[PDB]
Every structure is written in C-alpha cells, then in structure tokens.
Design an enzyme around this catalytic site. Structure first.
Site, PDB file in Angstrom:
ATOM      1  N   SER A 296       0.446  11.500 -17.012  1.00  0.00           N
ATOM      2  CA  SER A 296      -0.753  11.890 -17.666  1.00  0.00           C
ATOM      3  C   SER A 296      -0.694  13.137 -18.605  1.00  0.00           C
ATOM      4  CB  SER A 296      -1.826  11.857 -16.597  1.00  0.00           C
ATOM      5  OG  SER A 296      -2.999  12.545 -17.135  1.00  0.00           O
TER       6      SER A 296
ATOM      7  N   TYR B 108      -6.742  16.545  -9.662  1.00  0.00           N
ATOM      8  CA  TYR B 108      -6.099  15.332 -10.144  1.00  0.00           C
ATOM      9  C   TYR B 108      -4.796  15.862 -10.891  1.00  0.00           C
ATOM     10  CZ  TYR B 108      -5.031  11.775 -13.590  1.00  0.00           C
ATOM     11  OH  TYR B 108      -4.237  10.962 -14.632  1.00  0.00           O
TER      12      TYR B 108
ATOM     13  N   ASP C 223       1.106  -1.358   0.075  1.00  0.00           N
ATOM     14  CA  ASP C 223       0.063   0.100  -0.002  1.00  0.00           C
ATOM     15  C   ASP C 223       0.832   1.172  -0.035  1.00  0.00           C
ATOM     16  OD1 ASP C 223      -2.002   1.979   0.307  1.00  0.00           O
ATOM     17  OD2 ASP C 223      -2.959   1.023   1.858  1.00  0.00           O
TER      18      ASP C 223
END
Ligand SMILES: CCCCN(C)C(=O)CCCCCCCCCC[C@@H]1Cc2cc(O)ccc2[C@H]2CC[C@]3(C)[C@@H](O)[C@H](Cl)C[C@H]3[C@H]12
Lengths: 279, 278
Positions: free
Chosen positions: B142, B155, B65
């Site tokens: 991205s 984001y 995690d």
C-alpha cells in the site's frame, strides 16, 4: 521543576546508560523513571547509578511488562509528578534466523513487544501530553527499520512498523506541540541455538546464515558504537527546540540508504545489499 | 504444464479480480487456486468467473484462514500439482481512527492478518520454491506502507512491516531463483461520532473529521478499479527480471519523492500535514 523522563527497557544497553546519563547530569534537571521487565536484573543499573553518583531522587525503578496494558497503566500511576515530559520507548527484542526456522510464538512475541508494546505506551501517555500541549517521545530505531536485512525479516518488520507508526502519529501531533523522534542506531556493542536452526531449514540456507553472521561480525568490528555514544544522540534530540522526526547515530549506513532511497523499484538496494553481505 | 497460482483473500476486491483475470486469460497457461476465509462467500468470485467463461479446471477454491497455520497447511496439501509457481499474498485488514480510541484486539488482529498472515504463508510455501530453484511471490502493498498517514497509525505500521519483511527476504532469495515483489496500490474502489468523541479529545476529534473529509476527496480523485490493480500483478508476474516494487499509479509518487529526499523526515511531516489538513 525537573524534566520527568520515563524510559522502557533499562536492564542493559541503551536504556540503562540513558537512564544513568540523564540522572547523573551535572544540571540536576532530570528525574528518571527507569523501567524493567524483571526486577532481578536491576543490579547493573544500580551499580551504574552508584558509580556515576546519581543524586537522591534522580532515579526510580518500576517493573513494567509492555505486553500488558494493566502493567503499563500501573507504571503511569506510579509517576507521582502527574506528568511525563519525555517518554523513551526502548524495550525491544531481536529475532535472528531463517524465516522458516522461526516459531510462530516467537514472531508474535517480537511484534507484541516491539510494535504493540509501543502502541500501549503511546495510548497511555500521549493523551496527557496532547492536552498539556507539550511532551517529547523518543523511540529507539534501527538501521533495520530503514532497510531490509537478510535473516532479520521479522526484526526488520517490527522496526519498519515503528517507522510507520511514528511517522503517522507525527503528522497528526505537529500542531499539538508534542514531538516524536526516532533515534536510528547502527550496530551497538552491549553486554534458539544453531542446531535447531539447521534442523528447521535446508543445509544451504544454513550456509547463507553463516555467511550473514560472518559479515555481521565484521560490520560490528568496523562500526559498532557503544551505548554511551547512543545516549548522547537521545540527549541531542531531547534538547533540540524543534526536533526532527529522525536522528542518525552514525553516518556509516548512509551510502546503502541512498541506494535504497534513489531507486524506489528497490532493484539497486537488493543487488547492492546482496553484494555487501554475501560478497 | 500450467503456471500454478495460489492467491489469498479472493472473496472480493483485488484477489477476486486477479483470480478471474488469470483463470480467463486467452493463453490458458494459469491454474488458479483462489482461497477464501469462508467458502460461503465465494458467489461473486464464481459469478465473475462464469461471466468471463473461465474453462473447467482453470479455477479452484480452497478455504484458507491466514490467522491459522493449520488452515494454511491443509490448503497447501490440496494443491494437487505438488507445487506453487506463483504465491500471491493479498488477504488484509484496515484500521482507522485515533490511536487511543483503538482496541487492543483490533490492533493485534491487523498485525496478525497483515504481517503474521504473510509470514505463515511464506513459511508454508517458500521451502519448496527454494529447493526447486524457482517461484514468484507477489504481495499486496500500500501507499500506507510507503509513507505514514494520520489516523492510520496501526494500519501503516502493518504495511511498513510488510515492506521490511519482503525486502529482507528479497535479499536472501536472490540467488535461490525465487523472486519476490510488492504491488504498491493507492486506495481501491471495492464507530459513531459520539463513540469516537468519548475516546479522545475535542481537538483530535476535529482533525479526524478533517482527515475523513480530505480522504473522501482523494478517493473520488484517485481510487483505483481492482481490475487495474490485478493487471499490474500480471505485469509483475510475467516480467523476465522482476523488480522488488511495482507501483499501480503515479499519483502518490510526488509525496513519496519528498519523503525519500529528506531522511530526517522534516519535509514529509510538514508536507503531509498540509496535504491532509490544509
Ligand atoms: C550487524 C548486522 C548486519 C548488518 C549488515 C549491513 O550490511 C549493515 C548493517 C548491519 C547491522 C546494523 C545493526 C543491526 C540492525 C542490529 O540492530 C541487529 Cl542486532 C542486526 C544489525 C546489523
């Protein structure tokens, strides 16, 4: 009616000098709410306000913790006028050192203040501006938000984050008549230790850290601006009838920025910046 | 001696397809530690690996995690070879909506995963690479880290942040022999109206609908297969002289050029507003 301005991070540097500059302007058109994290640091501000003869009711101080949305909401409610014409998000933290030497607490705090703190401010204040169809948001930016700087990995992360945040919002806010701008500063001359760094990293990285620190001192000596000069750029942005998304306070990092923007692969920038800093 | 690769977020999407691609490569030169937040989600990963006949010992899974440095440390201890030659930082989260409609814990979570997650990984694995003088770091980027997209404010802030983190590091890592690259992806194929309307104004709500409509169409036109994206990771992984940034598609490059040609941001903002909202 005065232009009501709320500025975060007014205990020193850019926020202090912007607050007193606007409050003392010969026109008497600005009412400034100057915010501070700790009330005990407000002496420099009041001395500056006194020396510049800020007229009565031009400058008010509020306590404001940008990490706490209840503190942010209480600051909003202290604005007796029921509007903010200009919001200046300026409170921020630096973090300098090898990435593997940085405490996770310190990383999370720099993000929480620089990024999430600005989100909190925009959440609280943008809705009234959008419904009014007017308002100006000025954000303290950095050359470190435009290009990556060694040993400032997390600082640059936080300033790059503001670039993304503001540009995303600006696309939406255009037809609302609400204008957002970043003020991109180079080095500014204003008013944990090396031992822990060395203990948390390799001796060679420490030497690279020293070399970076020496290059940075030289950059400051050739290029540091003062907060008075930066304040004038905030004024230029806030006066512009059709403001742009970014204002540059200096021309000095533009050759590097061109190298970055002319090669999207990032190859020209990384080599050139490596040469700039480390010879 | 195989190339040891550790990849975050392998339960689906880019991470799954890259893991199985490397594990099943005809050269057999990769040993892949595919990590997942919960090992109970590993079914599709292993079904894919079996369908591609990944040899025994080409692929192992670990729980990791990225929100917890104890989990990162324990995963690092499981790498039996005592090195990672390629670290792929890929685990990520999206967040879509009016800024004022987003909860503070969602905002904090996107930053913690997309940014601090990558910091945690780099803090755990970079020191051994620096002192070996070799290693490759690949990071899922991205188009949202390269240009601001309306209703993706947080984001985009998190992907822009990654850009700044990685670029800063790349400058320092250049002489250590450690090479870092971002893989810039377009969209990848892998609240109710009334609730959103409660949390914002009528005009913003309308713009949100419009952005959602336009985004549906960009996705049909432009969404990429995760296999394609994984293949671009492999291209970067095998480059003799790797560059900082690889693009998985040409589609968003015109908008990017327009952003880069006007540092004032005036051309980008107007152009992107027209693209999205007509
Ligand atoms: C000074 C330091 C190092 C540096 C190196 C360059 O090649 C170009 C610019 C800079 C400075 C720009 C202003 C920065 C980003 C400040 O905001 C922080 Cl304190 C570090 C500073 C940077």
């Amino acid at each position: 009616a005065r232009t009501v301005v709320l500025i975060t991070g007014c205990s020193s540097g850019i926020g202090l000098h912007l607050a007193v500059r606007l409050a003392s302007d010969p026109s008497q058109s600005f009412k400034v709410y100057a915010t501070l994290r700790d009330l005990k640091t407000q002496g420099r501000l009041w001395e500056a306000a006194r020396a510049l003869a800020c007229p009565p009711g031009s400058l008010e101080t509020l306590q404001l913790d940008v990490r706490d949305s209840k503190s942010v909401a209480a600051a909003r409610e202290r604005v007796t006028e029921g509007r903010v014409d200009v919001l200046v998000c300026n409170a921020g933290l630096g973090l300098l050192g090898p990435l593997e030497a940085l405490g996770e607490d310190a990383v999370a705090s720099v993000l929480d203040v620089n990024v999430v703190g600005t989100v909190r401010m925009l959440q609280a204040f943008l809705p009234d501006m959008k419904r009014r169809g007017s308002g100006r948001v000025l954000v303290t930016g950095s050359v470190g938000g435009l290009m990556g700087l060694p040993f400032n990995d997390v600082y640059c992360a936080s300033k790059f984050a503001l670039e993304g945040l503001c540009e995303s919002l600006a696309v939406l806010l255009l037809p609302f008549g609400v204008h957002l701008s970043l003020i991109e500063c180079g080095p500014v001359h204003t008013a944990g230790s090396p031992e822990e760094v060395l203990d948390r990293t390799d001796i060679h990285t420490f030497h690279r850290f020293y070399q970076y620190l020496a290059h940075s001192k030289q950059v400051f000596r050739e290029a540091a601006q003062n907060p008075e000069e930066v304040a004038e750029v905030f004024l230029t942005a806030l006066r512009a009838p059709k403001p742009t998304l970014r204002y540059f306070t200096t021309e000095r990092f533009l050759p590097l920025l061109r190298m970055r923007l002319d090669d999207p692969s990032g190859s020209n920038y990384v080599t050139a910046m490596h040469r700039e800093v480390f010879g």
